[PDB]
Design an enzyme around this catalytic site. Sequence first.
Site, PDB file in Angstrom:
ATOM      1  CG  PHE A 103      10.713  21.582 -35.903  1.00 41.77           C
ATOM      2  CD1 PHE A 103       9.971  20.742 -36.730  1.00 41.77           C
ATOM      3  CD2 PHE A 103      10.401  22.927 -35.887  1.00 41.77           C
ATOM      4  CE1 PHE A 103       8.988  21.267 -37.568  1.00 41.77           C
ATOM      5  CE2 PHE A 103       9.412  23.442 -36.721  1.00 41.77           C
ATOM      6  CZ  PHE A 103       8.724  22.611 -37.567  1.00 41.77           C
ATOM      7  NE  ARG A 118      -6.908  25.177 -39.542  1.00 42.34           N
ATOM      8  CZ  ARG A 118      -7.026  23.943 -39.073  1.00 42.34           C
ATOM      9  NH1 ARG A 118      -7.863  23.089 -39.643  1.00 42.34           N
ATOM     10  NH2 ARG A 118      -6.310  23.555 -38.024  1.00 42.34           N
ATOM     11  CE  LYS A 119      -0.378  28.590 -39.584  1.00 45.34           C
ATOM     12  NZ  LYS A 119      -1.526  27.737 -39.173  1.00 45.34           N
ATOM     13  CD  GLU A 121     -10.998  25.179 -50.249  1.00 51.66           C
ATOM     14  OE1 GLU A 121      -9.887  25.660 -49.927  1.00 51.66           O
ATOM     15  OE2 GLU A 121     -12.076  25.806 -50.132  1.00 51.66           O
ATOM     16  CE  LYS A 158     -15.062  30.737 -56.614  1.00 52.92           C
ATOM     17  NZ  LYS A 158     -15.299  30.533 -58.061  1.00 52.92           N
ATOM     18  CG  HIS A 200       3.129  26.195 -41.476  1.00 50.01           C
ATOM     19  ND1 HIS A 200       1.842  25.866 -41.849  1.00 50.01           N
ATOM     20  CD2 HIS A 200       3.246  26.095 -40.140  1.00 50.01           C
ATOM     21  CE1 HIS A 200       1.192  25.638 -40.719  1.00 50.01           C
ATOM     22  NE2 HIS A 200       1.999  25.783 -39.658  1.00 50.01           N
ATOM     23  CG  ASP A 221       0.255  20.402 -38.183  1.00 49.52           C
ATOM     24  OD1 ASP A 221      -0.757  19.847 -37.688  1.00 49.52           O
ATOM     25  OD2 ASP A 221       0.318  21.633 -38.431  1.00 49.52           O
ATOM     26  CB  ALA A 222      -3.039  17.385 -41.424  1.00 50.12           C
ATOM     27  CE  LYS A 232     -11.977  30.912 -50.856  1.00 56.21           C
ATOM     28  NZ  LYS A 232     -12.605  31.629 -49.724  1.00 56.21           N
ATOM     29  CE  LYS A 264       3.100  27.896 -36.175  1.00 47.86           C
ATOM     30  NZ  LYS A 264       2.004  27.215 -35.394  1.00 47.86           N
ATOM     31  CG  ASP A 304     -14.397  34.538 -48.723  1.00 52.05           C
ATOM     32  OD1 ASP A 304     -15.077  35.321 -48.011  1.00 52.05           O
ATOM     33  OD2 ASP A 304     -14.566  33.302 -48.740  1.00 52.05           O
ATOM     34  CD  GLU A 340     -16.334  23.064 -55.215  1.00 53.80           C
ATOM     35  OE1 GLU A 340     -16.031  24.236 -54.889  1.00 53.80           O
ATOM     36  OE2 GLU A 340     -16.261  22.102 -54.421  1.00 53.80           O
ATOM     37  CG  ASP A 386      -2.133  25.087 -41.997  1.00 53.72           C
ATOM     38  OD1 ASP A 386      -2.718  23.994 -42.281  1.00 53.72           O
ATOM     39  OD2 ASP A 386      -2.143  25.603 -40.836  1.00 53.72           O
ATOM     40  CE  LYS A 387       0.425  31.610 -45.490  1.00 56.98           C
ATOM     41  NZ  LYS A 387      -0.399  31.584 -46.755  1.00 56.98           N
TER      42      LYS A 387
HETATM   43  C1  LIG Z   1       3.062  21.773 -33.326  1.00 54.16           C
HETATM   44  S1  LIG Z   1       2.251  21.376 -34.868  1.00 54.16           S
HETATM   45  C2  LIG Z   1       0.496  21.259 -34.458  1.00 54.16           C
HETATM   46  C3  LIG Z   1       0.125  20.205 -33.423  1.00 54.16           C
HETATM   47  C4  LIG Z   1       0.129  18.822 -34.065  1.00 54.16           C
HETATM   48  N1  LIG Z   1      -0.952  18.724 -35.070  1.00 54.16           N
HETATM   49  C5  LIG Z   1       0.088  17.743 -32.995  1.00 54.16           C
HETATM   50  O1  LIG Z   1      -0.163  16.554 -33.470  1.00 54.16           O
HETATM   51  O2  LIG Z   1       0.330  17.973 -31.831  1.00 54.16           O
HETATM   52  C6  LIG Z   1       1.899  22.910 -35.720  1.00 54.16           C
HETATM   53  C7  LIG Z   1       3.041  23.494 -36.514  1.00 54.16           C
HETATM   54  O3  LIG Z   1       4.179  23.594 -35.622  1.00 54.16           O
HETATM   55  C8  LIG Z   1       5.363  23.253 -36.331  1.00 54.16           C
HETATM   56  N2  LIG Z   1       5.991  22.093 -35.707  1.00 54.16           N
HETATM   57  C9  LIG Z   1       5.881  20.772 -36.063  1.00 54.16           C
HETATM   58  N3  LIG Z   1       6.648  19.967 -35.367  1.00 54.16           N
HETATM   59  C10 LIG Z   1       7.303  20.817 -34.487  1.00 54.16           C
HETATM   60  C11 LIG Z   1       8.279  20.590 -33.501  1.00 54.16           C
HETATM   61  N4  LIG Z   1       8.784  19.381 -33.213  1.00 54.16           N
HETATM   62  N5  LIG Z   1       8.737  21.662 -32.820  1.00 54.16           N
HETATM   63  C12 LIG Z   1       8.250  22.871 -33.110  1.00 54.16           C
HETATM   64  N6  LIG Z   1       7.329  23.210 -34.014  1.00 54.16           N
HETATM   65  C13 LIG Z   1       6.895  22.127 -34.675  1.00 54.16           C
HETATM   66  C14 LIG Z   1       4.969  23.023 -37.786  1.00 54.16           C
HETATM   67  O4  LIG Z   1       5.077  24.261 -38.474  1.00 54.16           O
HETATM   68  C15 LIG Z   1       3.520  22.585 -37.636  1.00 54.16           C
HETATM   69  O5  LIG Z   1       2.781  22.840 -38.825  1.00 54.16           O
HETATM   70  C1  LIG Z   2     -21.082  29.743 -52.844  1.00 56.19           C
HETATM   71  S1  LIG Z   2     -20.148  28.373 -52.175  1.00 56.19           S
HETATM   72  C2  LIG Z   2     -18.417  28.823 -52.420  1.00 56.19           C
HETATM   73  C3  LIG Z   2     -17.989  29.049 -53.865  1.00 56.19           C
HETATM   74  C4  LIG Z   2     -17.804  27.709 -54.568  1.00 56.19           C
HETATM   75  N1  LIG Z   2     -16.665  26.975 -53.974  1.00 56.19           N
HETATM   76  C5  LIG Z   2     -17.702  27.911 -56.071  1.00 56.19           C
HETATM   77  O1  LIG Z   2     -17.294  26.848 -56.709  1.00 56.19           O
HETATM   78  O2  LIG Z   2     -18.031  28.943 -56.612  1.00 56.19           O
HETATM   79  C6  LIG Z   2     -19.923  28.661 -50.423  1.00 56.19           C
HETATM   80  C7  LIG Z   2     -21.078  28.258 -49.540  1.00 56.19           C
HETATM   81  O3  LIG Z   2     -22.267  28.897 -50.066  1.00 56.19           O
HETATM   82  C8  LIG Z   2     -23.365  27.999 -49.969  1.00 56.19           C
HETATM   83  N2  LIG Z   2     -23.894  27.726 -51.301  1.00 56.19           N
HETATM   84  C9  LIG Z   2     -23.618  26.662 -52.124  1.00 56.19           C
HETATM   85  N3  LIG Z   2     -24.328  26.643 -53.227  1.00 56.19           N
HETATM   86  C10 LIG Z   2     -25.121  27.778 -53.126  1.00 56.19           C
HETATM   87  C11 LIG Z   2     -26.118  28.313 -53.960  1.00 56.19           C
HETATM   88  N4  LIG Z   2     -26.500  27.758 -55.120  1.00 56.19           N
HETATM   89  N5  LIG Z   2     -26.729  29.446 -53.552  1.00 56.19           N
HETATM   90  C12 LIG Z   2     -26.364  29.997 -52.391  1.00 56.19           C
HETATM   91  N6  LIG Z   2     -25.438  29.588 -51.522  1.00 56.19           N
HETATM   92  C13 LIG Z   2     -24.851  28.462 -51.953  1.00 56.19           C
HETATM   93  C14 LIG Z   2     -22.868  26.753 -49.243  1.00 56.19           C
HETATM   94  O4  LIG Z   2     -23.075  26.942 -47.851  1.00 56.19           O
HETATM   95  C15 LIG Z   2     -21.390  26.770 -49.602  1.00 56.19           C
HETATM   96  O5  LIG Z   2     -20.620  26.064 -48.635  1.00 56.19           O
END
Ligand SMILES: C[S@@+](CC[C@H](N)C(=O)[O-])C[C@H]1O[C@@H](n2cnc3c(N)ncnc32)[C@H](O)[C@@H]1O
Ligand SMILES: C[S@@+](CC[C@H](N)C(=O)[O-])C[C@H]1O[C@@H](n2cnc3c(N)ncnc32)[C@H](O)[C@@H]1O
Lengths: 380, 380
Positions: free
Chosen positions: A235, A249-250, A42, A274, A14, A243-244, A270, A166, A276, A55, A16-17
């Site tokens: 499919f 995102r999951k 990312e 972090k 998938h 799909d991007a 991360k 999925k 999170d 970063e 996103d995965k």
């Molecule tokens: C349906 S797509 C998301 C919507 C899409 N971004 C659009 O342009 O409509 C989301 C996820 O569904 C799955 N998918 C993609 N094409 C599909 C298809 N033809 N039938 C069913 N699932 C599909 C993939 O896992 C994809 O990442």
């Molecule tokens: C702390 S950063 C995420 C961690 C980062 N990606 C890293 O490289 O460690 C997440 C969010 O915190 C905020 N942030 C960025 N720089 C920061 C700083 N110096 N102090 C506090 N918050 C900050 C921004 O809103 C940023 O999108």
Amino acid sequence: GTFLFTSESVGEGHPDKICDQISDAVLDAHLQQDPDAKVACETVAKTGMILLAGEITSRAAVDYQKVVREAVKHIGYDDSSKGFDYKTCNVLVALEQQSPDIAQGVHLDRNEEDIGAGDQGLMFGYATDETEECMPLTIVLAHKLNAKLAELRRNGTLPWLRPDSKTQVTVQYMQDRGAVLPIRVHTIVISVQHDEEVCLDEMRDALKEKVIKAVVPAKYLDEDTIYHLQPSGRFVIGGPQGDAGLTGRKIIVDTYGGWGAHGGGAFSGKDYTKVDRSAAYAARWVAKSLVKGGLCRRVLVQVSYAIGVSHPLSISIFHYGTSQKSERELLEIVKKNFDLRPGVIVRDLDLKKPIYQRTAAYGHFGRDSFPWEVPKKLKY
Amino acid sequence: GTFLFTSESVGEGHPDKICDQISDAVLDAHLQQDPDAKVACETVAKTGMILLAGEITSRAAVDYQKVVREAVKHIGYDDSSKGFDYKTCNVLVALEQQSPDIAQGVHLDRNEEDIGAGDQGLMFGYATDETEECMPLTIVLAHKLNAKLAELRRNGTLPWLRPDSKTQVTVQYMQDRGAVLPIRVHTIVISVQHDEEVCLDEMRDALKEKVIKAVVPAKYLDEDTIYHLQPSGRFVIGGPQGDAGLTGRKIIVDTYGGWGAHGGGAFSGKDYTKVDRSAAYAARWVAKSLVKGGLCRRVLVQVSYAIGVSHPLSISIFHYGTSQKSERELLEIVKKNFDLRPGVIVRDLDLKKPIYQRTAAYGHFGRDSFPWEVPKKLKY
Ligand SMILES: C[S@@+](CC[C@H](N)C(=O)[O-])C[C@H]1O[C@@H](n2cnc3c(N)ncnc32)[C@H](O)[C@@H]1O
Ligand SMILES: C[S@@+](CC[C@H](N)C(=O)[O-])C[C@H]1O[C@@H](n2cnc3c(N)ncnc32)[C@H](O)[C@@H]1O
Ligand SMILES: COc1ccc(-c2c3c(C4CC4)nnc-3ccn2O)cc1
Ligand SMILES: COc1ccc(-c2c3c(C4CC4)nnc-3ccn2O)cc1
């Protein structure tokens, strides 16, 4: 007293995965050489492209082209007929050092145990006694259906399968003094990318007989169970071409499938600073310890942090009416047994180890005896 | 009987929120010319770059350079001194048509009312009577703190402020027969990007006196309230330069701040056929209607879909013990009053209107009397 609940899961291919697995392959590559790497990677995936953005401050020498392509090869995207190929895709890198303002506020010149949280945020941990692994049945089944598709694709049983899939499972539950008891599977959805040769009826028959029947116990399936197998009807286009994909995102597939609660933070790409990731792992560890310890049957833990501050700002516990102890009593037990500073969680859960790519598909919880899945013996 | 709960919010210039606003500016640009545009626009932001990746099939002629730069200008990133400039940043476009396999399975040759869900998934709606707008106090306060920062930056009161900010509020609540009653604010965190001239003490004093005191009622603040203001100590580097942003990475800020539940789907950059957005909006509309209708004080609604299928696969309602009616009775009321097919939700909630950029900061719920915030008068 009965109700329905639905959860979903996705396969390794998938889009996103794919991003979560690449982000964690990058993190692991850094940790293999520098256990103290600061990583916030990312990934974005679209037709023919993997882009790394973020970063990283690390002493490691990492070959991003090799790391990314090897992760895509593992997933199974190895030919243009499948819509994506690790050998020939574009790998673009937009990685900079970690912001020095973040570094000075979080970890520079700080004792490891007293490092500040890498960001503010809220995180939850959840556990339920409905399965031995202390996870909701809906999400366990949904993950196993995707794992079965990948197994049958890799062993050649269903050679028309492609990596993008999925699944979705709706279970009818009975309420039981705050705890939940699964009764039956109400609906299953499966969508999986496939080749241009196989027909819809062959796919639907295989998905029922070789996938659903191989994963879901027959006691949960009956004449009224609803099956939506290949519901779109076609499919062939899939993976990043269809799909991007983006990292993080999951997050509900990664955790509890809608059960418990979520604070919003993504895990993949991360390092331990972090919160999170590290504090969500520690909160799952606390929740599972309370259930396996016999203190509750179902429990939710919330923790929160401020950037630069080591101790959590708040800790809360909700037992759904399944404990004889009050929230105040459970919080006192948690305070006596756990230290939820990131600089201590890293030691308890061994979070500098490069095992993160393994967590990036099929859920981060309820599998493979990772440190956060081994309950702590509680003293009180 | 008391407990703590924490929620967070982010400002318009938080990099993830920049992406959500750009994705929705792109959607609105398409809808202004083609109400039936099929849009799935993801945005990635890093130092000097906005990348659009996704799928759009539309009859509109959209100038992506202009749309993107105008959205960044609105946010306030207009000079290299601030770390990002709409005039000179790179705007990269990797947009393709919607997959024909998705189009044929979802909407091609289908009557509008009977269009299939654009994907599978689960979505939740939540409402609570603790505020007039039926939202948790934690998230309402967190959003208002970011809105106050943007107001003071735009009116020149605090000219050292920059667009990137985050806030977090912990409230102590009392339980009340399933409903929750806010008692006091336990902790507030505020972090905001700033210029190189202002000192930390001036910022902390302004954040307490001009931001917190201007937003949070004094009755909630006391001698024990904890303030973490600029806790990192320095935040000059910010926006996409400080942290990569992606669309759909603030889904809990977009919804209920951790309360209720979340199915995982992001809202921004998607047209109504994507049930991740339309069905979540409809579920909020159902939840708010049940609370404003006097049937419950707090309620959670879950719905789920399969790609290509119009009707929800499952509908569930949890009233937290705050209704005299059973879940079966509330489900019957919902079935009599609502039609949760995407092709009907679009008509009820006017989802072809280009108002989406307005939803992409400060939460999608509890503000501005959007159609999903106007309760339906229930007949039963
Ligand atoms: C349906 S797509 C998301 C919507 C899409 N971004 C659009 O342009 O409509 C989301 C996820 O569904 C799955 N998918 C993609 N094409 C599909 C298809 N033809 N039938 C069913 N699932 C599909 C993939 O896992 C994809 O990442
Ligand atoms: C702390 S950063 C995420 C961690 C980062 N990606 C890293 O490289 O460690 C997440 C969010 O915190 C905020 N942030 C960025 N720089 C920061 C700083 N110096 N102090 C506090 N918050 C900050 C921004 O809103 C940023 O999108
Ligand atoms: C966020 O985790 C949850 C999980 C489950 C419930 C829940 C119900 C629901 C939910 C809408 C699906 N519907 N009927 C229910 C009856 C009992 N219980 O416990 C509530 C919240
Ligand atoms: C997902 O929404 C929720 C929201 C709130 C609660 C909750 C508590 C918690 C949560 C860990 C923060 N801690 N103590 C609690 C006492 C009562 N109630 O209702 C549970 C779930």
